[PDB]
């Protein structure tokens, strides 16, 4: 089943270790992080080095599809 949730997005960026933090927070969809910024992502317990890695892939997703 093709889905746009956060799980598939992390694989695309060669990442799959920060998914657990999203699960324990109640966030399981890319739509939940569409407007979140780098500073807002910090509250999610993710290190700062991962704020630019995950956030960067989210910007490109917007360019491909028009909201």
From Swiss-Prot:
<feature type="domain" description="SAM">
    <location>
        <begin position="1"/>
        <end position="64"/>
    </location>
</feature>
<comment type="similarity">
    <text>Belongs to the p53 family.</text>
</comment>
<comment type="function">
    <text>Acts as a sequence specific DNA binding transcriptional activator or repressor. The isoforms contain a varying set of transactivation and auto-regulating transactivation inhibiting domains thus showing an isoform specific activity. Isoform 2 activates RIPK4 transcription. May be required in conjunction with TP73/p73 for initiation of p53/TP53 dependent apoptosis in response to genotoxic insults and the presence of activated oncogenes. Involved in Notch signaling by probably inducing JAG1 and JAG2. Plays a role in the regulation of epithelial morphogenesis.</text>
</comment>
<comment type="subunit">
    <text>Binds DNA as a homotetramer. Isoform composition of the tetramer may determine transactivation activity. Isoforms Alpha and Gamma interact with HIPK2. Interacts with SSRP1, leading to stimulate coactivator activity. Isoform 1 and isoform 2 interact with WWP1. Interacts with PDS5A. Isoform 5 (via activation domain) interacts with NOC2L.</text>
</comment>
<protein>
    <recommendedName>
        <fullName>Tumor protein 63</fullName>
    </recommendedName>
</protein>
